[PDB]
Amino acid sequence: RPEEGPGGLPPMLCPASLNICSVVSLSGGTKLLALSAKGR
């Protein structure tokens, strides 16, 4: 931002990824590993 009044939220224009996982690199940027709902 104590914290924050509303949660107004962006998409990153990806589909429904269920079972997300994040690894924090800080090698670039943040680089994460997900499973799209269709099985990918």
Partner 1 sequence: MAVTEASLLRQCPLLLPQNRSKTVYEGFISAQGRDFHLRIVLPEDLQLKNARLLCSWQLRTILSGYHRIVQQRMQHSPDLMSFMMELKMLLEVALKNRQELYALPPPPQFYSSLIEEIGTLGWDKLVYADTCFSTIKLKAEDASGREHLITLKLKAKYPAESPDYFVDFPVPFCASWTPQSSLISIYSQFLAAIESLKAFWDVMDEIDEKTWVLEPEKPPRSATARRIALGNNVSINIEVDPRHPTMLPECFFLGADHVVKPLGIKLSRNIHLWDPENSVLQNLKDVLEIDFPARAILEKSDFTMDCGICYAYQLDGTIPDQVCDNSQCGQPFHQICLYEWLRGLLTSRQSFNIIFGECPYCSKPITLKM
What is the C-alpha to C-alpha distance for residues 20 and 25, in angstroms, rounded to an integer? 16
Q: How many Å apart are CA 21 and CA 7, to the nearest integer?
A: 22
Complex with partner 1: residue 11 or 28, whichever CB lies closer: 11
Binding to partner 1 by residue 2, rule CB under 8 A? no
Chosen residue from 5, 28, 29, 39 binding partner 1 by CB under 8 A? 5
Answer for which of 8, 28, 29, 39 binds partner 1 (CB under 8 A) is 8
Q: What percent of the chain is helix, strand and coil (3-state, nearest 5)?
A: 0, 20, 80
Q: Which residues bind partner 1 (CB under 8 A)?
A: 4-6, 8, 10
